[PDB]
């Protein structure tokens, strides 16, 4: 997904699927559309839900990636708190 | 079947989960995070998300709401100071659109303790009678003995 700004409905579906690869790919697809500068908050609860505690680095690294380029803007699955869904289980 | 089990810290959520999964009473630590496990009961495989109840984590439950078929809300029946707080958490949880049709099962837990509030008492304090929009049930439990646990899984499976 080079740059496709309407694809956020499919990404939500792909983000949790019971297959780790699909989830990684989805979250990756979100990153590439934001970096170009395209739509991203719809997904947030889905994105945040699988990855949170785990020591399994790749999804964690992917989520960690998305928190330095848009964390502030996206708020469906995060909202505003001191120990946000950016860092609460990332302790 | 997808299940979300929450409640305040120390209610007994992880004790419940691992009693169900291992038939064992484990020595818990506060859960900073979740535990997720699959349990077989009578041809149903329940995937239970036990999400820690301390404040930081409490702020995160909303990410586990979506796709939830049923909600286990664990209450420490012996703690009277925090029952109002439980009531407050649970009431706005009931207002959550992703939790809209999910089956609501309250566990009044630590029923084994001498001064534990009764399930009826808890039902009045949590305002359970006022839920008309979906299925609810309250069950007295003791997670250490295992009492009431499978009666819960039973009720849940009949959603």
From Swiss-Prot, chain A:
Predominantly expressed in the upper one-third of the oxyntic mucosa and in most regions of the pyloric mucosa. Ubiquitously expressed including platelet, liver, heart, spleen, lung and kidney. It is found in: Cytoplasm; Golgi apparatus membrane; Cytoplasmic vesicle, COPI-coated vesicle membrane; Cell membrane. It comes from the Eukaryota. Brefeldin A induces dissociation from the Golgi of the beta-COP and presumably the other coatomer subunits. Oligomeric complex that consists of at least the alpha, beta, beta', gamma, delta, epsilon and zeta subunits. Interacts with CAPN8. Interacts with SCYL1 and PRKCE. Interacts with COPG1. Interacts with ARF1 (myristoylated); this interaction is required for binding of COPB1 to Golgi membranes. Interacts (via trunk domain) with ARF1 (via switch I region); the interaction is direct. Interacts with KCNK2 (via N-terminus); this interaction increases the channel-mediated whole cell currents and promotes plasma membrane expression of KCNK2. Interacts with STX17. Interacts with TMEM115. The coatomer is a cytosolic protein complex that binds to dilysine motifs and reversibly associates with Golgi non-clathrin-coated vesicles, which further mediate biosynthetic protein transport from the ER, via the Golgi up to the trans Golgi network. Coatomer complex is required for budding from Golgi membranes, and is essential for the retrograde Golgi-to-ER transport of dilysine-tagged proteins. This is Coatomer subunit beta. The chain holds residues 16 to 106 of 953 of the full protein.
Curated annotation (Swiss-Prot), chain B:
It comes from the Eukaryota. It holds the Pfam family Arf. It is found in: Golgi apparatus. Keywords: ER-Golgi transport, Golgi apparatus, GTP-binding, Hydrolase, Isopeptide bond, Lipoprotein, Myristate, Nucleotide-binding, Protein transport, Transport, Ubl conjugation. InterPro entries: Arf1-5-like (IPR045872), P-loop_NTPase (IPR027417), Small_GTP-bd (IPR005225), Small_GTPase_ARF (IPR024156), Small_GTPase_ARF/SAR (IPR006689). GO terms for biological process: endoplasmic reticulum to Golgi vesicle-mediated transport; Golgi to plasma membrane transport; Golgi vesicle transport; intracellular protein transport; macroautophagy; positive regulation of mitochondrial fission; positive regulation of mitochondrial fusion; protein localization to Golgi membrane. Gene3D superfamilies: P-loop containing nucleotide triphosphate hydrolases. It catalyses: GTP + H2O = GDP + phosphate + H(+). Its main location: Golgi. Disruption phenotype: Increases phosphatidylserine levels in the outer leaflet of the cell membrane. Simultaneous knockout of DRS2 results in inviability. SMART domains: ARF, RAB, SAR. GO terms for cellular component: cytoplasm; cytosol; Golgi apparatus; organelle membrane contact site; plasma membrane. It is an enzyme of class 3 (hydrolase). One of its GO terms (molecular function) is GTP binding. GTP binds at residues 8-15, 31, 53, 109-112, 143-144. Its EC number is 3.6.5.2. Interacts with RUD3. Interacts with VPS13 (via C-terminal part); the interaction is direct. PANTHER family: ADP RIBOSYLATION FACTOR-RELATED (PTHR11711). Present with 19300 molecules/cell in log phase SD medium. Belongs to the small GTPase superfamily. Arf family. GTP-binding protein involved in Golgi vesicle trafficking. May modulate vesicle budding and uncoating within the Golgi apparatus. May recruit the lipid transfer protein VPS13 to Golgi membranes. Recruits polyadenylate-binding protein PAB1 to COPI vesicles, and this is required for correct localization of the asymmetrically distributed ASH1 mRNA. This is ADP-ribosylation factor 1. It comes from Saccharomyces cerevisiae (strain ATCC 204508 / S288c).
